[PDB]
Amino acid sequence: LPEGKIMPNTVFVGGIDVRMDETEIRSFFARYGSVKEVKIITDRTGVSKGYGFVSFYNDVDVQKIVESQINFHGKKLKLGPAIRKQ
RNA sequence: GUUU
Ligand SMILES: [Zn+2]
């Protein structure tokens, strides 16, 4: 516990600041593959929750990607395997 | 700080 399924070829990205949009994240992660979707999680009024997910069409090594130290806006993004809690 |  907690029960969760690890989502293949998807990376959790947290520490997403308000000036970082989906397109900027896609442009960075394109170094790893053909990005299928970047989704920043927002509440129903479009307030970002400050985290999102990047998924790929190609198989990627999520463990290697999450070692990356990515710093756009002065803080390291917080990366992890993507889990859907069940 | 893990998507419904
Ligand atoms: Zn930027």
Would you write up a description of this structure?
With 86 residues, the chain is of the alpha+beta class. The protein has helices at residues 22-29, 62-66, and strands at residues 4-14, 35-42, 48-56, 78-85. The protein has one domain (1-86): Alpha-Beta Plaits. The longest helix is centred in the N-terminal third of the chain and has 8 residues, at 22-29. The protein has a four-stranded antiparallel β-sheet with strand order 2-3-1-4. The site of zinc ion has 3 residues, from loops. It binds one RNA strand of 4 nucleotides through strand 1, strand 3 and strand 4. The PDB classes it as rna binding protein/rna.
Largest sheet: 4 strands, antiparallel
The shape, in one word, is globular
Computed structural class? alpha+beta
CATH superfamily name?
A: RRM (RNA recognition motif) domain
The percent range for strand residues is: 35-45%
CATH topological fold name: Alpha-Beta Plaits
Oligomer: monomer
Overall CATH class: Alpha Beta
Distinct small-molecule ligands in the complex: zinc ion
Query: Total domains, how many?
Result: 1
Q: What percent of residues adopt helix (DSSP H or I)?
A: 10-25%
Number of strands: 4
- Roughly how many Å is the radius of gyration? 13 Å
Sheet with the most strands: spatial strand order: 2-3-1-4
CATH architecture: 2-Layer Sandwich
| Individual helix count | 2
Ends apart, CA distance between termini? 10 Å
Order of helices and strands: EHEEHE
